[PDB]
Design a protein around this ligand. Structure first.
Ligand SMILES: *[C@@H]1O[C@H](CO)[C@@H](O[C@@H]2O[C@H](CO)[C@@H](O[C@@H]3O[C@H](CO)[C@@H](O)[C@H](O)[C@@H]3O)[C@H](O)[C@H]2NC(C)=O)[C@H](O)[C@H]1NC(C)=O
Ligand SMILES: *[C@@H]1O[C@H](CO)[C@@H](O[C@@H]2O[C@H](CO)[C@@H](O)[C@H](O)[C@H]2NC(C)=O)[C@H](O)[C@H]1NC(C)=O
Ligand SMILES: *[C@@H]1O[C@H](CO)[C@@H](O[C@@H]2O[C@H](CO)[C@@H](O)[C@H](O)[C@H]2NC(C)=O)[C@H](O)[C@H]1NC(C)=O
Ligand SMILES: *[C@@H]1O[C@H](CO)[C@@H](O[C@@H]2O[C@H](CO)[C@@H](O)[C@H](O)[C@H]2NC(C)=O)[C@H](O)[C@H]1NC(C)=O
Ligand SMILES: *[C@@H]1O[C@H](CO)[C@@H](O[C@@H]2O[C@H](CO)[C@@H](O)[C@H](O)[C@H]2NC(C)=O)[C@H](O)[C@H]1NC(C)=O
Ligand SMILES: *[C@@H]1O[C@H](CO)[C@@H](O[C@@H]2O[C@H](CO)[C@@H](O)[C@H](O)[C@H]2NC(C)=O)[C@H](O)[C@H]1NC(C)=O
Ligand SMILES: *[C@@H]1O[C@H](CO)[C@@H](O)[C@H](O)[C@H]1NC(C)=O
Ligand SMILES: *[C@@H]1O[C@H](CO)[C@@H](O)[C@H](O)[C@H]1NC(C)=O
Ligand SMILES: *[C@@H]1O[C@H](CO)[C@@H](O)[C@H](O)[C@H]1NC(C)=O
Ligand SMILES: *[C@@H]1O[C@H](CO)[C@@H](O)[C@H](O)[C@H]1NC(C)=O
Ligand SMILES: *[C@@H]1O[C@H](CO)[C@@H](O)[C@H](O)[C@H]1NC(C)=O
Ligand SMILES: *[C@@H]1O[C@H](CO)[C@@H](O)[C@H](O)[C@H]1NC(C)=O
Lengths: 418, 92, 184
C-alpha cells in the first residue's frame, strides 16, 4: 500500500436489565382471608422465589460496577486546548446539555424508548395492584456519564499510562506516534502527514452522528432487552384470567356461591395453577440473567483492553489495525467508538528473499526487498517508503547457495566514502 | 415507600387503622424525599461516603455514631483529580 | 429446602403418608396420594432446574481459570488488567477448596518528574527521530531516554534515524547530534 485511511466504527453492548420483585400472596390470593389461609398449608414456594429474584436484582449492579468503575480517580476534562488538530467536541461533555452528557450520548438516549401512586388512584397500575414491582437501579444516569467523561478525559491527556498506575501527561501527537509505531508503521509517517490524519479523523467523527440521526434500527440490541422484560410482566398479568379446571377464574365468585368444604376444591386448583406461572417467570428470568452477565463480562474486558490500552488481537476492537477507542453510555448498555488504520491504494512490485553481494547473503532487518524494474530498494511492509540497501538495513548470514531465489546486486557501505 | 410522595404516605398506607407503633413511621421531622420514594427514620447528612447499605437512585445509608443513628447520604464516585496537560511537556 | 418441603400437604388431608393409609381405603386414598405425588415431583424438578442453572456459571468460571492458568502462569500476557494491576511479570498458583488462587507479580512505575519534549531534532537540514525512547530536556541540554524509566543518554547517530527535512514536522527544535566515530 501507498496511502492509508482512518476509520471510526461503532459497537453496542447490553450491560444490565430491569430489577423486579413479586409479592406471592397479593398475586395469588389478593387480600382474601379464606385464601392466604389455604395458602399456608402449601409449602415454602414463596421465599424460594424471592431469594432467586433478589439474587438476580443485586447482580445487575455488579454488572455496571464492573464495566464503568474501572478507575476511581475522577479526572477532569481540561479546558479544550490544541490536541494537534483533533476536535473531540462531539464526545466531550458540554456545560449546557442536560445532565452534562455529550452530543453523541444525547443522540443515543432519544432512539431507545424505555407512575406515582397518586396517578394510579392502564397496564402499569393493573400490575402494581397484583404485587409486581420494578425496583430502581443504584447508579443513576448522571453518575455513569461522570465515569465515562473521566475514562474519556484520562486517555486523551495521559494515554495508556493511567490504567497501570499514576497518570502521566504527554502531547497528543507524541501519543499517536507511538500508537502508529505499535502497528508496524514508523513515526515520520505520522509526523509528516499530521494535517491529513487530523482531517480524516474529524470527518469520520462527523459521520457517526449523521448515521445515528436517520436510522431507527440503530440500537437494536438495547431495545430487545427492554421489550422482553415488559412482555414477561404483561404475560404474568394476562395469566390471571385462566381457570385451571376450576368453575371460574374469579376468586370472589367461588367464595360467594360455595361453602368452605365445597370451595377448597376449586381454590386448591387456582392456587396450584397460579404458582406454576410464577415459577415459569422466575426460571425464564434466571435464564436471561446468564446472558446479560456474559455480555457485561465481554464489555468489561473490551473496556480494559481497547480503551485503557491497545490490543494486538485481530478484529477484537474493530476492523483493521487498532489505534484507540472511546466509550459512550447508552441506556442499559455501552457503545464503543473504535479508531482503526486501514491500508489503501497499493502497487505491484517484484521481490526477492535475499541479496548476494560478493559471497554473502544479506537479509533485511525490518522491511522487504522491492524493485521498480531496474533498481532495488528496501521498504517497510505496511507503507511504501523506499530507501537504499546498505549495511545498516541488512545483516549477513551464510553464502549464496542455500537460499532459493537469491539475486545479485550491490550493497553500499556507508563509511567507505570517508 | 416506593413510589409515593412524602405527604401522601398517611393516605397510601391507611395510617389511621394501624397500631401507634406503626404510626411513627408515617409522620414528619425525618421525612426525606429521594427519587426512589419517601424515606422515613433516617437522618440526612450532606457529605458523601462510600456505600454501606444501597437504597437506590444514588442514595445509600449507614449506621453511624454522631449517640447512634441511621444516616442516609449520596454515594461518592471517587477522589477528584486533575492532570496538567500541555503541548511540550511530559512526565517520566 | 428439599427436606423441609416434605411437611407440605399439597391440598391433601395430611402431609404424612401413614395417616392417609391408616384411615382411608384404597379408592378413597388414591385421591390424596395422587396429590402428594404430584406435589413432591415438582420440588424435585425445581431442584434439578436450579442445579442445571448454577452448573453453567461454575463452568464459565472454570474456563476463565483455565485460560488464566495457561496465559498468566505458563507465559507472560500483554493483555491489560488480565493478570493484575500494572505490567505483568509472573504468577504463581495455589489451591483452595473448590477453587484456585493466583498470586500475580506486577511492575508499577513510581515517583516521576516533569520534562520538556520535542518530536524531532533538526541538525543541519535533516530530521532525526529516536529509535526507542523520547527526547527530553533538563532546561539547557537535550537527552534521549526510555519512556518507562528515566535514564538519560546523549543524542548520537545510533540513537536516531534520519527522514526528510525540517519543514513538515510541526514542533521541531534545533540541536546537535554527535557523530560517534568522528573523533577517531
Ligand atoms: C492519500 O489520500 C488522501 C485522501 O484520503 C489524499 O488527500 C487528498 O488530496 C487531494 C489532492 O490534494 C485533495 O483534493 C483536493 O480537493 C479540494 C476540494 O476538497 C480541492 O480544492 C483541491 O484542489 C484538491 O482537488 C483531497 O481532498 C485530499 N483528501 C483529504 C481528505 O485531504 C492524499 O493526497 C493521498 N496522498 C497520496 C500520497 O496519494
Ligand atoms: C469542532 O467541531 C464542532 C462541530 O462541527 C465545531 O462547532 C461548530 O462547528 C460548526 C461547523 O463546523 C460551526 O459552524 C460552528 O460555528 C461551530 N461552533 C459552535 C457554535 O458550535 C467546533 O468549532 C470545532 N472546534 C474547533 C476547534 O474548530
Ligand atoms: C527506478 O528508480 C530509480 C531511482 O529513483 C530511477 O533512477 C532515476 O531515473 C531518473 C530518470 O529520469 C534519473 O533522472 C535519476 O538520476 C535516476 N536516479 C535517481 C538518483 O533517482 C529508475 O529510472 C527507476 N526505474 C524506473 C523504470 O522507473
Ligand atoms: C550472480 O553472481 C554469481 C557469482 O557470485 C554468478 O555465478 C557465476 O555464474 C557463472 C555462469 O554464468 C559461472 O561460470 C561461475 O562459476 C559462477 N560463479 C562465479 C564464481 O562467478 C551468477 O551467474 C550471478 N547471477 C546473475 C547474473 O544473476
Ligand atoms: C543539564 O544536565 C547537564 C549535563 O549533566 C548539565 O551540565 C553539567 O553542569 C554541571 C554544573 O555544575 C557541570 O559541572 C558539568 O560539567 C555539566 N556537564 C556535564 C558533563 O555533566 C546542565 O547544567 C544541566 N542543566 C541544569 C539546569 O540542570
Ligand atoms: C533553527 O535552524 C534554522 C536553520 O536551519 C533557523 O532558520 C533560519 O531562520 C532565519 C530567521 O531567524 C532565516 O533568516 C533563515 O533563512 C532560516 N534558515 C536558514 C537557512 O538559516 C531557525 O531559526 C532555527 N531556529 C531556532 C533558532 O530555534
Ligand atoms: C497488480 O497485478 C495484477 C496482475 O497483473 C493486476 O490484476 C492488478 O490490477 C495490479 N495492480 C494492483 C493489484 O494494484
Ligand atoms: C518462480 O517460478 C518460475 C516458474 O516455475 C521459475 O522459473 C522461477 O525460477 C521462480 N523464482 C523463484 C525465485 O523461485
Ligand atoms: C408531591 O411531590 C411533588 C414533588 O416531588 C410536589 O411538586 C407536589 O406538590 C407534591 N404533592 C403534594 C404536596 O400534594
Ligand atoms: C445540607 O444543605 C442544605 C442546603 O444548604 C441545608 O438546608 C441543610 O441544613 C444542610 N444539612 C446539613 C447536615 O448541614
Ligand atoms: C509537574 O508539573 C505540574 C504542573 O506544573 C505539577 O502540578 C506537578 O506537581 C509537577 N510534578 C510532577 C507531576 O511530578
Ligand atoms: C505549544 O502551544 C503554544 C501555544 O499555542 C505555541 O505557542 C507553541 O508553538 C506550541 N508548541 C508546539 C511544539 O506545538
Amino acid at each position: 500500500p501507498t496511502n492509508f485511511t482512518i476509520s471510526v466504527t461503532t459497537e453496542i453492548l447490553p450491560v444490565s436489565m430491569t430489577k423486579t420483585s413479586v409479592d406471592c400472596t397479593m398475586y395469588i390470593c389478593g387480600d382474601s382471608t379464606e385464601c392466604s389461609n389455604l395458602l399456608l398449608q402449601y409449602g415454602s414456594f414463596c421465599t424460594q422465589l424471592n431469594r432467586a429474584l433478589t439474587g438476580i436484582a443485586v447482580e445487575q449492579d455488579k454488572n455496571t460496577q464492573e464495566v464503568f468503575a474501572q478507575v476511581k480517580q475522577i479526572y477532569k476534562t481540561p479546558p479544550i486546548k490544541d490536541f494537534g488538530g483533533f476536535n473531540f467536541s462531539q464526545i466531550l461533555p458540554d456545560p449546557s446539555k442536560p445532565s452534562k452528557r455529550s452530543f453523541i450520548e444525547d443522540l443515543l438516549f432519544n432512539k431507545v424508548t424505555l407512575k406515582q401512586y397518586g396517578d394510579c388512584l392502564d397496564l402499569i397500575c393493573a400490575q402494581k395492584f397484583n404485587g409486581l414491582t420494578v425496583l430502581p437501579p443504584l447508579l443513576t444516569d448522571e453518575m455513569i456519564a461522570q465515569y465515562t467523561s473521566a475514562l474519556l478525559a484520562g486517555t486523551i491527556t495521559s494515554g495508556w499510562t493511567f490504567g497501570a498506575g499514576a497518570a502521566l501527561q504527554i502531547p497528543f501527537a507524541m501519543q499517536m506516534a507511538y500508537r502508529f509505531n505499535g502497528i508496524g508503521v514508523t513515526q515520520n509517517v505520522l509526523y509528516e502527514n499530521q494535517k491529513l490524519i487530523a482531517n480524516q479523523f474529524n470527518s469520520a467523527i462527523g459521520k457517526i452522528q449523521d448515521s445515528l440521526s436517520s436510522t431507527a434500527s440503530a440500537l437494536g440490541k438495547l431495545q430487545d432487552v427492554v421489550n422482553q422484560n415488559a412482555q414477561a410482566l404483561n404475560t404474568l398479568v394476562k395469566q390471571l384470567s385462566s381457570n385451571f379446571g376450576a368453575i371460574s377464574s374469579v376468586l370472589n365468585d367461588i367464595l360467594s356461591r360455595l361453602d368452605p368444604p365445597e370451595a377448597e376444591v376449586q381454590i386448591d386448583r387456582l392456587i396450584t395453577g397460579r404458582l406454576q406461572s410464577l415459577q415459569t417467570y422466575v426460571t425464564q428470568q434466571l435464564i436471561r440473567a446468564a446472558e446479560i452477565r456474559a455480555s457485561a463480562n465481554l464489555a468489561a474486558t473490551k473496556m480494559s483492553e481497547c480503551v485503557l490500552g491497545q490490543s494486538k488481537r485481530v478484529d477484537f476492537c474493530g476492523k483493521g489495525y487498532h489505534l484507540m477507542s472511546f466509550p459512550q453510555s447508552a441506556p442499559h448498555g455501552v457503545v464503543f467508538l473504535h479508531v482503526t488504520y486501514v491500508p489503501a491504494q497499493e502497487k505491484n512490485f517484484t521481490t526477492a528473499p535475499a541479496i548476494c553481494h560478493d559471497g554473502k547473503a544479506h537479509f533485511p532487518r525490518e522491511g522487504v526487498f522491492v524493485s521498480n524494474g531496474t533498481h532495488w530498494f528496501v521498504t517497510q511492509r505496511n507503507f511504501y517508503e523506499p530507501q537504499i540497501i546498505t549495511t545498516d538495513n541488512t545483516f549477513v548470514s551464510g553464502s549464496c547457495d542455500v537460499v532459493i531465489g537469491i539475486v545479485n546486486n550491490t550493497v553500499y557501505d556507508p563509511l567507505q566514502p570517508e | 415507600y416506593q413510589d409515593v410522595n412524602c405527604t401522601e404516605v398517611p393516605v397510601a398506607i391507611h395510617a389511621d387503622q394501624l397500631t401507634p407503633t406503626w404510626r411513627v413511621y408515617s409522620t414528619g421531622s425525618n421525612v426525606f424525599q429521594t427519587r426512589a420514594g419517601c424515606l422515613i427514620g433516617a437522618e440526612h447528612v450532606n457529605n458523601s461516603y462510600e456505600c454501606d447499605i444501597p437504597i437506590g437512585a444514588g442514595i445509600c445509608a449507614s449506621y453511624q455514631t454522631q449517640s447512634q443513628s441511621i444516616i442516609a447520604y449520596t454515594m461518592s464516585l471517587g477522589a477528584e483529580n486533575s492532570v496538567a496537560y500541555s503541548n511540550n511537556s511530559i512526565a517520566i
